[PDB]
Design a protein around this ligand. Structure first.
Ligand SMILES: CO[C@]1(C(=O)O)C[C@H](O)[C@@H](NC(C)=O)[C@H]([C@H](O)[C@H](O)CO)O1
Length: 160
């Protein structure tokens, strides 16, 4: 567990999980290869009926319709597009009590956590030039090698 690091944009090594510890609802992390993949993770508060919100994604204001069916858990949503002018689509989510998320560049993809704490799993998004994707963290974060993924999973499920 290397960190906490303050918000910044950098090029994380492949096969490391970037464990994010946001404190507020909103954009958590975003990264793109500038060609066929844009991913931004948004943290939505517990208990939200369908509504459109404005988020700044990659420097520009975007309207996204979100919801969170859970009465008590947070919802992390990956908002992605596959071309520069394409529409954002939602995948995931991760329903969470600890408020932690993580993202990793691995084997031609970007992986993120998914499901419902305390029994999370991971999902992925194929991404060309996956190894050079820079990630912008909007909150404090830690770095954990993939070899220690069981430790990252325990933090996502139960907190630091
Ligand atoms: C093309 O197949 C895949 C991929 O990227 O390898 C399979 C992968 O399991 C799926 N992941 C999820 C969370 O649905 C992903 C997304 O649907 C797509 O990347 C969204 O842009 O599509």
């Amino acid at each position: 567990l290397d960190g906490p690091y303050q918000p910044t944009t950098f090029n994380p090594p492949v096969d490391y999980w970037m464990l994010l510890a946001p404190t507020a609802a909103g954009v958590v992390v975003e990264g793109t290869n500038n060609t066929d993949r844009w991913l931004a993770t948004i943290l939505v508060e517990p208990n939200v009926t369908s509504e459109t919100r404005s988020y700044t994604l990659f420097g520009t204001q975007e309207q996204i319709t979100i919801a969170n069916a859970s009465q008590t858990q947070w919802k992390f949503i990956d908002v992605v597009k596959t071309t520069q002018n394409g529409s954002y689509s939602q995948y995931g989510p991760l329903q969470s009590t600890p408020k932690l998320y993580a993202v990793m560049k691995h084997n031609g993809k970007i992986y993120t956590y998914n499901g419902e704490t305390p029994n999370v799993t991971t999902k992925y998004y194929s991404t060309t030039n996956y190894d050079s994707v820079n990630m912008t963290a909007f909150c404090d974060f830690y770095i954990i090698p993939r070899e220690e993924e069981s430790t990252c999973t325990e933090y996502i499920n139960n907190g630091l």
